[PDB]
Design a protein around this ligand. Sequence first.
Ligand SMILES: [Cl-]
Ligand SMILES: [Cl-]
Ligand SMILES: [Cl-]
Ligand SMILES: [Cl-]
Ligand SMILES: [Fe+3]
Ligand SMILES: [Mg+2]
Ligand SMILES: [Mg+2]
Lengths: 197, 212
Amino acid sequence: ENAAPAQAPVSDRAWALFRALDGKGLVPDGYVEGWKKTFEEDFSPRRGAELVARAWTDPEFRQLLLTDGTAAVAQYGYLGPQGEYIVAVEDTPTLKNVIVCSLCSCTAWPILGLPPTWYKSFEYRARVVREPRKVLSEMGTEIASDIEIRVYDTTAETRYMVLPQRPAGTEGWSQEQLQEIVTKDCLIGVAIPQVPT
Amino acid sequence: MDGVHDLAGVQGFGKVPHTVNADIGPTFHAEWEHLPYSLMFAGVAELGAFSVDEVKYVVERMEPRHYMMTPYYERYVIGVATLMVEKGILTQDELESLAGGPFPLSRPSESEGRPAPVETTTFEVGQRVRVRDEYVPGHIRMPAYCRGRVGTISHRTTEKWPFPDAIGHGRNDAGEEPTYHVKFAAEELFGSDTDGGSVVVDLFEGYLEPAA
Ligand SMILES: [Cl-]
Ligand SMILES: [Cl-]
Ligand SMILES: [Cl-]
Ligand SMILES: [Cl-]
Ligand SMILES: [Fe+3]
Ligand SMILES: [Mg+2]
Ligand SMILES: [Mg+2]
């Protein structure tokens, strides 16, 4: 009762699906290898960090990114699959934003990178909508009690990124230096950018 | 579809398996893991055989215990394979033959889907809306926690998309609708049993009605 179905190893299944389609001429030459390189090398949270660092140092860009995120992203050439309609959500001294896809894994791939295992976990999908403060605390991020947490559930085509607050002690840093501290987790909304000493 | 995939709000799960900024390792942790997505794109963009929405639905159609025990990327292997069999492109026999053993698929759909709603309303930013108290056995992009609940519009998209509940079944009658960012108070969705502030759900126009 309630046992798993019998299954061949997953890698055997996955490559069976490839070979079945490839052997019918349905997969162009180099097609899955090309998508693998896109996924690994081009879709990257370095791109969302670049966007946050520009917004932090350019009030006009900041305004653009918060009003028409798609156009802002397009300036950099970072629109792409699962990241065609972009909304950036602004953290403030009383508001902390966090992104999930409760139904599956929906993420702004080109600017955040493909989601991490933990973001697609049942634990995150179930819990962050209902108890985001406790989830973040458990993950290492304490949100002061004076801050509304707002969770965006990525249920349609909008693809989100968080614009975190700029931490004190970064005044006058270059865009390069600022990018370095805007991590994947800061874009998702579960981490606050950290300044070393 | 009120499946086990509609996880938001479910209680009893443990800790998220991460601490912030921990090393998540490479993009793909096994040499096959790029295949589901790549093959979804082949199916959507090169073959024209199905929509992305049909991929989301076929994963929802995994047998529920099968869904709950299956790692993420494997669910998409199963789902894309299932769609290739359902569309007549592949056979389950040849998948099993090449795999060298069992390759169970998602279950058949129990709904033909539904069309884009004929009657809907253009809402504006600041407007109070309720999520229609409807039950859809087929695909729908409405998590049950917001069904029948009331919130306020913070955005109407400037683009329109096919209605999931149609195009997720491959129907010809998905139309196009904008979606709306609907902000609900935490207490509207979970009563006193939440530590949160608000939740914003991106909801198709066809899932909404004016509030009381
Ligand atoms: Cl992870
Ligand atoms: Cl492999
Ligand atoms: Cl209550
Ligand atoms: Cl209506
Ligand atoms: Fe998703
Ligand atoms: Mg400053
Ligand atoms: Mg349910």
